[PDB]
């Protein structure tokens, strides 16, 4: 019973069959439907910014090309991941993976550590709990109520307050993906 999971994302069904077959032959992983606390490797069939890619970066997983599985099968063992990192599409991926690997104790990002508390709309996309998870894992502070926050993320129907930034979910996601706190001005609702 492996203690790490691997997740497939943007994976055509015929490629999923191959990954499942390779993991059955090389062992070393359980396959999980979505990124979770045990996940170390996220395999993408097409470099689309899915929720699993985002969660993968937030947790400092390997975010890898499908070709990693193909080469590993050919050589009869799991090979080095570095050559297969999807850094062109997701520049933060190798950055967060490097820092996670250096961590003593559970890893937590610091991208958002200098931001004030954020309230995430219950109506957000990606869904509220996952978007909060992303904010927390990337070193941000999550408010339970809007009065607690200087930043409110996603659809919000309450009365607006003057010293609060009302930003799209994309502000969070583009920041995570680039490992830069994006300029709020471009994400205003």
């Amino acid at each position: 019973k492996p203690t790490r999971t691997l997740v497939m994302t943007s994976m055509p069904s015929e490629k999923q069959n191959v990954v499942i077959q390779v993991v059955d032959k090389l062992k070393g992983f359980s396959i999980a439907p979505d990124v979770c606390e045990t996940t170390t490797h996220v395999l993408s069939g097409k470099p689309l910014r899915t929720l699993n890619v985002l969660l993968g970066i937030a947790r400092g997983c390997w975010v890898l090309s499908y070709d990693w599985v193909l080469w590993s099968l050919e050589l009869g063992h799991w090979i080095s991941e570095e050559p297969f990192e999807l850094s062109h599409h997701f520049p933060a991926a190798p950055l967060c993976r490097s820092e996670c690997h250096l961590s003593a104790g559970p890893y937590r990002g610091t991208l958002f550590a200098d931001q004030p508390a954020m309230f995430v709309s219950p109506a957000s996309s990606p869904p509220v709990a996952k978007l909060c998870e992303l904010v927390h894992l990337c070193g941000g502070r999550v408010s339970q109520v809007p009065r607690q926050a200087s930043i409110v993320i996603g659809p919000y129907s309450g009365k607006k307050k003057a010293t609060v930034k009302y930003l799209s979910e994309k502000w969070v996601l583009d920041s995570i993906t680039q490992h830069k706190v994006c300029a709020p001005e471009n994400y205003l609702l």
Binding site: T9, R49, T50, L51, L54, S125, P126, E169, L173
Partner: peptide, 6 residues
């Protein structure tokens, strides 16, 4: 069907 791109 595909996982949603964000």
């Amino acid at each position: 069907q595909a996982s949603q791109e964000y």
